[PDB]
Design an enzyme around this catalytic site. Structure first.
Site, PDB file in Angstrom:
ATOM      1  NE  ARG A  26     -22.898  -5.573  -4.831  1.00 16.72           N
ATOM      2  CZ  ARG A  26     -21.996  -4.884  -5.527  1.00 16.72           C
ATOM      3  NH1 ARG A  26     -20.809  -4.588  -4.997  1.00 16.72           N
ATOM      4  NH2 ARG A  26     -22.281  -4.495  -6.764  1.00 16.72           N
ATOM      5  CD  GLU A  37     -14.331 -10.479  -6.389  1.00 15.32           C
ATOM      6  OE1 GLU A  37     -13.164 -10.135  -6.084  1.00 15.32           O
ATOM      7  OE2 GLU A  37     -15.239 -10.637  -5.536  1.00 15.32           O
ATOM      8  CG  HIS A  90     -11.294 -13.436  -2.375  1.00 17.33           C
ATOM      9  ND1 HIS A  90     -11.501 -13.925  -3.647  1.00 17.33           N
ATOM     10  CD2 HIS A  90     -12.104 -12.359  -2.251  1.00 17.33           C
ATOM     11  CE1 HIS A  90     -12.401 -13.182  -4.263  1.00 17.33           C
ATOM     12  NE2 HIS A  90     -12.787 -12.228  -3.436  1.00 17.33           N
ATOM     13  CG  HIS A 110     -16.410 -11.141  -0.251  1.00 17.45           C
ATOM     14  ND1 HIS A 110     -17.301 -11.458  -1.253  1.00 17.45           N
ATOM     15  CD2 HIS A 110     -15.314 -10.635  -0.869  1.00 17.45           C
ATOM     16  CE1 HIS A 110     -16.771 -11.153  -2.425  1.00 17.45           C
ATOM     17  NE2 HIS A 110     -15.566 -10.654  -2.220  1.00 17.45           N
ATOM     18  CD  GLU A 111     -12.016  -9.126   0.803  1.00 15.43           C
ATOM     19  OE1 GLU A 111     -11.023  -9.622   0.214  1.00 15.43           O
ATOM     20  OE2 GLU A 111     -12.855  -8.407   0.211  1.00 15.43           O
TER      21      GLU A 111
HETATM   22 ZN   LIG Z   1     -13.857 -10.330  -3.712  1.00 15.67          ZN
END
Ligand SMILES: [Zn+2]
Lengths: 410, 430
Positions: B359, B257, B223, B219-220
């Site tokens: 999630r 995001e 980014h 996830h990071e």
């Molecule tokens: Zn994030």
């Protein structure tokens, strides 16, 4: 003394502000002979990405060694803490206060279920229950040692039957959601099925938000002297751009629906989950108390299968939650299709009329360069703007159970 | 070429190659050097707490919070000794091996390695390359301990630190110079991460479960990917309504995001905003393509070959070259690349491809975090299967991540060290 209930920020309603959504649809659009439509699908096939050669690095990575850094100019962010407590004041008795009434402190041993909400707030030994009073009084009855197993088996069995109450007019409805939470407008008060039959999904919402539906801005078509082709192409491009705006408007409604209405119904789903647990927690502590009243002699005689009870209670809630999810999801889509989309369609049909007048007037101003084909294009414009782009939710959500709800609608 | 993860211990000596003493971008050249470890080309691990912008006392659990959205867990004694810092490294090596264990994750990594920051900034004249800025270059010390300071520069893409005061709050920060961000303007810049593998997030699909740390890391890394490509742009954000008592308080949520999470969440970003971002990203790339056609010299470093970096950036942004050498943007190439970066690499898409449960939405309720007992124990967590180990009967229906089923994989966290933002709702009477 202050009477304060504590609630986590995360358990509140997320509702997106009006300023979250672009007004860009309200801008004017230049329409030229070579204007084309812009769609950005929020999707990319993962199986192509792996095989795509146009994303593999084709030149070797240069050496990392370089000259030393001397210019240390940089913005370093500063982090400070803020208090973890925020004090607020309200006379309202919403989900939070209705959920708190279903809880009890650790010190309290002897508790009883009640149907009166106010009595559940006041006395710390009364706990609010939203099931039928027939169930409530059965959960408060003391019995003999031999009749205790006949009581437990029945009361846990009664819990299951009370949780699966569902009648009725589209899909299924759970009539005790109002009593459980009092969410939106006086939900616990009056009949729930009656109040719903009048207003629908709207009464469950804690906050009805003002929809952002911009007036689609005028199209400004450019003229082309004595060029029949560029004039026809411009009319075509204007008609295809019209479809772009419908699609954009539909996106805008969806974005507002998910971040504004669908989030509220998520909380209500989570709210019901907590309520059903608090009810099973209240029933557990009641059984605990009645059991301790007995002496070591009376307790040893009757072996209660606690392994079955926890299994029955977990499954009891599980069946109930499925019914509640079914109903609440249907409500969330109901509000989209009945209270949101039709309002946008209305404004988009207005856009069509403004565009129709625009186009015909444009054809009027160029009737000379169009020779005797002006009436031909007139009816072309007339025919085309009679057919609208229908809304399809599958564009905005992949592999979902919410599409089944959407496909139910006319 | 094929991505190679390196092996090393924290105790290993400094060789000024794969193990160095690095002066990170936020140290400001104040002589604070950290021991740094090159895990892959252009990616560095510093197994120390992220202290930039925080106070020493902020690492303790206080009656306050940093962010109102997180159940904040504090622990000042995390990564305080050499044995602990070493566990960090081997865990990071194991997670990186899990990532490259599938083609998708391997592509994510090679994108990151090769997506080098542009040798410049908005303040750099078009005709120039400039390495002497904090978003491009980072110093390493080559001097023996306690000697005349001798420094050397290296190019870096990502620097990974351990967590700040809040262990479960993993963030990817970019570098701003004079209120402007290169990683938001098409240039890209050195990215930094504060990460913790042990303390993971928890969720529960209503329609619970603990999170796989490799996904949290990926996830990071998405980014990071956006930052290295200079496409982490600011656009109108989702802001919560705060006018009523029953309304949740949170910071502005950027589209970037929501794209990164993927799934249904990009729909909360309107087609209008989608198009605004797209246009800004294109308009940034148009600037970069103009720079490459004009760049002649590099003032800060005479050993920089101009043709080498002109070819590399061409391959980074997928520019097209004609027979004369002029660069341009092929709209189809850009569109495919944009959509791959924004909508291809997403937590949802990756979770599907890695058989990991995650999630449902970004706006899902968060629960108290859990400490993962032992990630280096292959009976708990593996490179090929994470928690969902089939030979432990944990693969089917994400059994390995289920809190009820796999009770031995995790420990619950003490309430005393948790900081949750609470709303005190008072009657207004008495
Ligand atoms: Zn994030």
């Amino acid at each position: 003394n202050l009477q304060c209930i504590d609630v986590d920020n995360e358990d509140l309603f997320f509702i997106a502000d009006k300023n979250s959504f672009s007004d860009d649809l309200s801008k004017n659009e230049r329409i030229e002979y070579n204007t084309q439509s812009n769609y950005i699908e929020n999707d990319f096939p993962i199986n192509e990405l792996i095989l795509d050669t146009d994303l593999i690095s084709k030149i070797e990575l240069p050496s990392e060694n370089t000259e030393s850094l001397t210019d240390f100019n940089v913005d370093v962010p500063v982090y400070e803490k803020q208090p973890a407590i925020k004090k607020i004041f309200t006379d309202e008795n919403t989900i939070f206060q209705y959920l708190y009434s279903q809880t009890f402190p650790l010190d309290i041993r002897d508790i009883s279920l009640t149907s009166s909400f106010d009595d559940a707030l006041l006395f710390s030994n009364k706990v609010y229950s939203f099931f039928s009073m027939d169930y409530i009084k059965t959960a408060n009855k003391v019995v003999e040692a031999g009749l205790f197993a006949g009581w437990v088996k029945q009361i846990v069995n009664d819990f299951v039957i009370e949780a699966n109450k569902s009648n009725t007019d589209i899909s299924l409805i759970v009539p005790y959601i109002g009593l459980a939470l009092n969410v939106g407008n006086e939900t616990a008060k009056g009949n729930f099925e009656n109040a719903f039959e009048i207003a629908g999904a709207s009464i469950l919402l804690e906050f009805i938000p003002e929809l952002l539906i911009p007036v689609v801005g005028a199209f400004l078509l450019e003229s082309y002297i004595d060029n029949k082709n560029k004039i026809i192409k411009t009319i075509d491009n204007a008609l295809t751009k019209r479809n772009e705006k419908w699609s954009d408007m539909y996106g805008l409604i969806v974005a507002q629906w998910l971040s504004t209405v669908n989030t509220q119904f998520y909380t209500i789903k989570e709210g019901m989950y907590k309520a059903l647990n608090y009810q099973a927690q209240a029933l557990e502590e009641i059984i605990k108390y009645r059991y301790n009243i007995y002496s070591e002699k009376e307790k040893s005689n009757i072996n209660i299968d606690f392994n079955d009870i926890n299994s029955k209670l977990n499954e009891g809630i599980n069946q109930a939650i499925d019914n509640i999810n079914n109903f609440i999801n249907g409500c969330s889509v109901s509000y989209l299709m009945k209270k949101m989309i039709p309002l946008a369609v209305e404004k988009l049909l207005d856009f069509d009329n403004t565009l129709k007048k625009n186009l015909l007037n444009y054809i009027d101003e160029n009737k000379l360069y169009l020779i005797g084909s002006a009436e031909y294009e007139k009816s072309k414009v007339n025919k085309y703007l009679k057919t609208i782009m229908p809304f399809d939710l599958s564009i905005y959500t992949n592999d979902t159970i919410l599409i089944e709800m959407f496909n139910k609608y006319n | 070429m094929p991505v190679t993860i390196n092996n090393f211990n924290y105790n290993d000596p400094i060789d000024n190659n794969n193990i160095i003493m690095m002066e990170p971008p936020f140290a400001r050249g104040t002589g604070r050097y950290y021991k740094a470890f090159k895990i892959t080309d252009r990616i560095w691990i510093i197994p120390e707490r992220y202290t930039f912008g925080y106070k020493p006392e902020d690492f303790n659990k206080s009656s306050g919070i940093f962010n109102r959205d997180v159940c904040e867990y504090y622990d000042p004694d995390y990564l305080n000794t050499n044995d602990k810092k070493n566990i960090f490294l081997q865990t990071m090596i194991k997670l990186f091996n899990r990532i490259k264990s599938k083609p998708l994750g391997e592509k994510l990594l090679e994108m990151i390695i090769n997506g080098i920051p542009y040798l410049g900034d908005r303040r750099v004249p078009l005709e120039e390359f400039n390495t002497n800025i904090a978003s491009v270059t980072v110093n390493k010390l080559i001097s023996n301990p306690g000697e005349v300071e001798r420094k050397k520069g290296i190019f870096a893409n990502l620097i990974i630190f351990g967590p700040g005061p809040v262990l479960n709050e993993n963030e990817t920060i970019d570098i701003g110079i004079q209120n402007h961000f290169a990683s938001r303007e098409g240039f890209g810049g050195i990215m930094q991460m504060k990460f913790c593998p042990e303390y993971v997030s928890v969720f529960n699909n209503v329609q619970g479960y603990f999170s796989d740390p490799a996904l949290i890391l990926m996830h990071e890394l998405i980014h990071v990917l956006h930052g290295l490509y200079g496409i982490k742009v600011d656009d109108l954000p989702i802001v919560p309504n705060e006018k009523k008592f029953f309304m949740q308080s949170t910071d502005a949520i950027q589209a970037e995001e929501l794209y990164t999470f993927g799934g249904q969440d990009p729909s909360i970003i309107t087609p209008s905003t989608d198009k605004s971002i797209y246009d800004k990203v294109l308009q940034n790339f148009r600037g970069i393509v103009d720079r490459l056609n004009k760049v002649l010299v590099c003032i800060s470093d005479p050993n920089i070959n101009i043709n080498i970096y002109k070819n590399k950036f061409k391959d980074k942004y997928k520019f097209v070259e004609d027979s004369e050498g002029k660069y341009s943007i092929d709209v189809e190439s850009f569109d495919k690349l944009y959509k791959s970066l924004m909508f291809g690499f997403t937590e949802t898409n990756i979770a599907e491809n890695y058989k990991i449960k995650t999630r449902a939405s970004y706006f899902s309720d968060s629960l108290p975090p859990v400490k993962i007992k032992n990630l280096l124990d292959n009976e708990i967590y593996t490179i090929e299967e994470g928690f969902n180990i089939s030979d432990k009967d944990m693969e089917k229906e994400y059994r390995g991540q289920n809190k009820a089923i796999n009770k031995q994989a995790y420990e619950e966290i003490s309430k005393e060290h948790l900081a949750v933002y609470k709303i005190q709702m008072c009657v207004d009477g008495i």
